[PDB]
Amino acid sequence: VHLTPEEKSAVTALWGKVNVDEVGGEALGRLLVVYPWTQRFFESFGDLSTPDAVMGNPKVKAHGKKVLGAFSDGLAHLDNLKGTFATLSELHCDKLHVDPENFRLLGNVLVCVLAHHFGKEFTPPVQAAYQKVVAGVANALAHKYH
Amino acid sequence: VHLTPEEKSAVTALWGKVNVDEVGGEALGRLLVVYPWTQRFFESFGDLSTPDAVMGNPKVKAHGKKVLGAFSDGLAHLDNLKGTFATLSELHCDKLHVDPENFRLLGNVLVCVLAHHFGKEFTPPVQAAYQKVVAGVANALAHKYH
Amino acid sequence: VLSPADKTNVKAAWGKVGAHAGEYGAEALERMFLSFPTTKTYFPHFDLSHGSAQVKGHGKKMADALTNAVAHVDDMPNALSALSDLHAHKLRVDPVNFKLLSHCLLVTLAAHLPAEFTPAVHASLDKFLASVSTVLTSK
Amino acid sequence: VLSPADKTNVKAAWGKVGAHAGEYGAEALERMFLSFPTTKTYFPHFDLSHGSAQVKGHGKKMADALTNAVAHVDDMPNALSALSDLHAHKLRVDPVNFKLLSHCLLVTLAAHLPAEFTPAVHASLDKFLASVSTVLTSK
Ligand code: HEM
Ligand code: HEM
Ligand code: HEM
Ligand code: HEM
């Protein structure tokens, strides 16, 4: 993945503005709500019977934090996503058995979350640069499947 | 992509048995028939109004030959698909504007074609090794999109 | 199917779309063009750059078909029938592109309707757009 | 929709499936398990290896639901209604898996019916299986 200076600019800037403590929860949450089969992997999180319940779930917000960190991480190594996510690949691939299409779905739910919370700021070129990123993370994360 | 000796065995053997002069035409053909939007890229091939017409089309059989060679090629470099397809990537990505999902569709049409023509021989483990291959080609071919 | 709660969500979210209907569909297209450049081949005659009246007018046509679907949400195949043939037969739009456009629509809705884009409405708009896409690629 | 030629193709191709109906659905599952190992998590209690009666019996249940769909091809949502809830609500089967299974079915059909798996029938079976999948993930 190669971002342009302006794309790096667009991304790194708006990312700084990100509340790294809730955005991940909100993204994971909407994944569980918008794509309900994903819950299957999270049955240990308890109450997930309505969206309100899912969003207000501490284990989801907790875990969402971790997912967001991983993106923030991969943001550091846009040059090397493949190696960064090598660990996370094996886990998702060999132990969890999560179909990689779901990584793309999470990435797009994240883009929606960013859009929602940043409105006008989330311009179409800004969205574009971010699509490059989440795609890149997904593929890197999907490499122990390849 | 890493095939096992037995998977390499399964693959290389049955591949030798492949009529490299018609299989590509039959795969390209079924792509155009099973997934009709793909025709869009081939309007210069003329008569594609029925399946009979599509299959009996020399430009399709001709071009199918080339596609099959590319697979046969990538078969040589299972170790390095990414570099082999580097050329073909840029073309499909930058000039043709073919969505990479279509590469996966072609790969599976090819698997069906193999199944059809080899029947019993195309065992489930044999199919498995081949899924590794066509997936690998698709991703390699999709790298100038990444 | 679309649940009744799906229906009420969509009618609601689209209810507050308002006259911006055209503006939004144009912005969805730009977002799609920038984010997924392969999709530009279907418009190799439109002006695709920012400020394009070509995108904007079609953005309007598209958003009006959506609004038409919102109204006939229970008989969408009959409603979207003529556009089904258009996209699948004559235009030959790759079904992948519907997913790409649908996502950009959500993004555009999320960005203009902070309060209405709740998780539940999000899930409804998704099911809705997926439904429209299904009718449009049906032929 | 399914065209009438789609319908006649499928009824025909499945018509020559015969008592092998069960055998085939079992082989489709094995093919899926081997080719796409992620799909095995839905059967972490079945025996999944070759010769498994667990796979074979379910392979039969699945092929009988297909045959049921072939017969009620015009009212498949009503026909497949109970399996829709099963897969989407209780089992939570990722829609991706339907595509993977559908492809393995085609492969299995192509391998047992050399003469019947023409391009046109192929295209029909695909549209058909895609349709079944759509009903099964509808809820
Ligand atoms: C799309 C990008 C994704 C990223 C960057 C990501 C990252 C992570 C991280 C950082 C963890 C923490 C593991 C640990 O530290 O112990 C994790 C665990 C986990 N992931 Fe994801 N993940 C992604 C997608 C998904 C999806 C789509 C699913 C399911 C639909 C999923 C299912 C899980 C589950 C169930 C765990 C916890 C399992 C355990 O702790 O044993 N992940 N992931
Ligand atoms: C899936 C694996 C594929 C492989 C290995 C492959 C390989 C090739 C090869 C070897 C050529 C010959 C180019 C030349 O030598 O001049 C070619 C050209 C072409 N490909 Fe593919 N291809 C694949 C998929 C696709 C798909 C799915 C489509 C469209 C749906 C497509 C559209 C085209 C077109 C229209 C050309 C000719 C265009 C030109 O000559 O300017 N390809 N490809
Ligand atoms: C939400 C899904 C869609 C809706 C509701 C929709 C709606 C429409 C409508 C109403 C028209 C007729 C415009 C007119 O007559 O002026 C149209 C045309 C067209 N659409 Fe779509 N469309 C959708 C998806 C797509 C996608 C995904 C693509 C390509 C990536 C696409 C490409 C086109 C093209 C190339 C035309 C021709 C317009 C012209 O020739 O001026 N559409 N669409
Ligand atoms: C062609 C699409 C499908 C059809 C027609 C179908 C049909 C059926 C039927 C009739 C049953 C009930 C079996 C019984 O009651 O003994 C069943 C159960 C089940 N199906 Fe499916 N199915 C399909 C797709 C899938 C896919 C893609 C998966 C997973 C990757 C899946 C996983 C399961 C599981 C885990 C059960 C539970 C069986 C048991 O508990 O014994 N199905 N299916």
Curated annotation (Swiss-Prot), chains A, B:
Effect ascribed to mutating residue 14 to R: In Soegn; unstable
Effect after changing residue 60 to A: In Collingwood; unstable
Impact after mutating residue 23 to G: In Miyashiro; O(2) affinity up; unstable
Effect on the protein of changing residue 74 to V: In Bushwick; unstable
Effect of residue 131 to R: In Sarrebourg; unstable
Record annotation: effect of changing residue 37 to R: In Rothschild; O(2) affinity down
Effect of residue 145 to C: In Rainier; O(2) affinity up
Outcome, altering residue 139 to K: In Hinsdale; O(2) affinity down
Residue(s) at site: (Microbial infection) Cleavage: 7-8, 25-26, 29-30, 35-38, 45-46, 52-53, 56-57, 71-72, 74-75, 84-85, 92-93, 104-105, 110-111, 119-120, 122-123, 128-129, 140-141, 144-145
Reported function: Involved in oxygen transport from the lung to the various peripheral tissues.
Name by which UniProt lists this protein: Hemoglobin subunit beta
Source species of the chain: Homo sapiens (Human)
From Swiss-Prot, chains C, D:
Source species of the chain: Homo sapiens (Human)
Cellular component terms per the entry's GO annotation: blood microparticle; cytosol; endocytic vesicle lumen; extracellular exosome; extracellular region; extracellular space; haptoglobin-hemoglobin complex; hemoglobin complex
Family statement drawn from the similarity comment of this UniProt entry: Belongs to the globin family.
Quaternary data: Heterotetramer of two alpha chains and two beta chains in adult hemoglobin A (HbA); two alpha chains and two delta chains in adult hemoglobin A2 (HbA2); two alpha chains and two epsilon chains in early embryonic hemoglobin Gower-2; two alpha chains and two gamma chains in fetal hemoglobin F (HbF). (Microbial infection) Interacts with Staphylococcus aureus protein isdB.
Gene: HBA1
Additional facts recorded: Gives blood its red color.
Effect of residue 88 to S: In Loire; O(2) affinity up
Mutation effect (residue 11 to E): In Anantharaj
Outcome recorded upon mutating residue 16 to M: In Harbin; slightly unstable
Effect of residue 78 to K: In Stanleyville-2
Effect of residue 85 to Y: In Atago; O(2) affinity up
Outcome (variant: residue 12 to D): In J-Paris 1/J-Aljezur
Phosphotyrosine, modified sites: 24
Protein name, per record: Hemoglobin subunit alpha
Effect annotated for changing residue 115 to D: In J-Tongariki
Consequence of substituting residue 133 to R: In Val de Marne; O(2) affinity up and
Residue numbers bearing the Phosphoserine modification: 3, 35, 49, 102, 124, 131, 138
Impact reported for residue 58 to Y: In M-Boston/M-Osaka; O(2) affinity down
Mutagenesis or variant effect for residue 44 to L: In Milledgeville; O(2) affinity up and
Modified sites of kind N6-acetyllysine: 16
Mutagenesis or variant effect for residue 120 to E: In J-Meerut/J-Birmingham
Effect of residue 6 to G: In Swan River
Post-translational modification: The initiator Met is not cleaved in variant Thionville and is acetylated.
Result after altering residue 80 to R: In Ann Arbor; unstable
